[PDB]
Amino acid sequence: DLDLAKASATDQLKKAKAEAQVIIEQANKRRSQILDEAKAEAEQERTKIVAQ
Amino acid sequence: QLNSTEISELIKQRIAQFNVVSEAHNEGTIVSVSDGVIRIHGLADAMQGEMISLPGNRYAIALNLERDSVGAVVMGPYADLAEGMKVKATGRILEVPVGRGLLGRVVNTLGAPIDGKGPLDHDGFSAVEAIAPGVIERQSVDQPVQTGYKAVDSMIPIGRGQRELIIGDRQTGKTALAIDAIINQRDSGIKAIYVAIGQKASTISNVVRKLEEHGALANTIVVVATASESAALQYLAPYAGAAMGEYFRDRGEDAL
Ligand SMILES: Nc1ncnc2c1ncn2[C@@H]1O[C@H](COP(=O)(O)OP(=O)(O)OP(=O)(O)O)[C@@H](O)[C@H]1O
Numbered sequence A: 001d002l003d004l005a006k007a008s009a010t011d012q013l014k015k016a017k018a019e020a021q022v023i024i025e026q027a028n029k030r031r032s033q034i035l036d037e038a039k040a041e042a043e044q045e046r047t048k049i050v051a052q
Numbered sequence B: 001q002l003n004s005t006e007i008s009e010l011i012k013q014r015i016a017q018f019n020v021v022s023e024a025h026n027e028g029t030i031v032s033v034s035d036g037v038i039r040i041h042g043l044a045d046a047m048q049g050e051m052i053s054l055p056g057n058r059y060a061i062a063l064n065l066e067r068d069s070v071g072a073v074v075m076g077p078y079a080d081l082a083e084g085m086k087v088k089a090t091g092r093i094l095e096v097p098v099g100r101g102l103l104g105r106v107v108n109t110l111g112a113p114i115d116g117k118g119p120l121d122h123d124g125f126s127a128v129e130a131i132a133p134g135v136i137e138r139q140s141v142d143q144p145v146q147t148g149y150k151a152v153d154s155m156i157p158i159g160r161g162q163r164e165l166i167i168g169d170r171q172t173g174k175t176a177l178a179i180d181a182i183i184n185q186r187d188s189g190i191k192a193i194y195v196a197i198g199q200k201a202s203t204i205s206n207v208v209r210k211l212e213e214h215g216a217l218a219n220t221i222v223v224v225a226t227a228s229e230s231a232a233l234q235y236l237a238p239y240a241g242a243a244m245g246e247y248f249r250d251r252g253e254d255a256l
């Protein structure tokens, strides 16, 4: 159970590093969504202002 | 394109419209003046609620027909008057212009335009004092009036033809809620009217500017009586505003 415990602890440690990365990846994607919708709303607003 | 020739043609057309032959009129004299109230001697042919024309372009309303005098109120600055000035009687009962050509204009309670846009186009006149349609002529309200806000469309819904009082203390958002209601009818096919009684003038200009900023102004009539103007004008402001709204009601359209 020393051999088992060392191997299993490493598998757990691997897992946490991986899942931290996938959270950060998804966060950058959500950032990109927010910013692209920011560009979209910027343009829409300008189209209103010129008519005024 | 601004064009001089079309203006010249219009002036000539006004000369053609003028009729030189005169008409007999009943006349009277101002006897006493105070605080916008007037006492007039003469006008044997006057009727209660009539519009009396004073010197200049100002008018007055006949309130009391006493035995030997008429009690009246000036619809403007009264300080320029003096006992003895002749006043003529227009048989017209108090009236104001009406029509769909008024949309997008800022107008005094006497129907005169206050904006710099120019003279006004109207589909005749409607009377300021009138009695509303009777019990048999009414119909149940069955259609929504979608204002912008979540709360009042969900909890306190308003139907076309309903009367709903926005009540609260000063600086609580009453004005904002009302004009956001106007602005959301911009596309719903409901005509809008805004009557400002006694507000500070700067407010009214800022409100019209915000209505223009969202493109709702082309769907609104705005009636103005500033805090500076004579009390009679304020008192009659909502009645004039009501007289304009009835035009759309009676032609089968919806108005707010
Ligand atoms: N939805 C809102 N969110 C935040 N502030 C708002 C909102 N609606 C209105 N206000 C604010 O309320 C304040 C007063 O608005 P408003 O002029 O409509 O009030 P009022 O009670 O009608 O005022 P008054 O009695 O002076 O006419 C303004 O500062 C405005 O920004």
Ligand SMILES: [Mg+2]
Pocket (backbone or CB within 6 Å): B174, B175
């Ligand atoms: Mg207000």
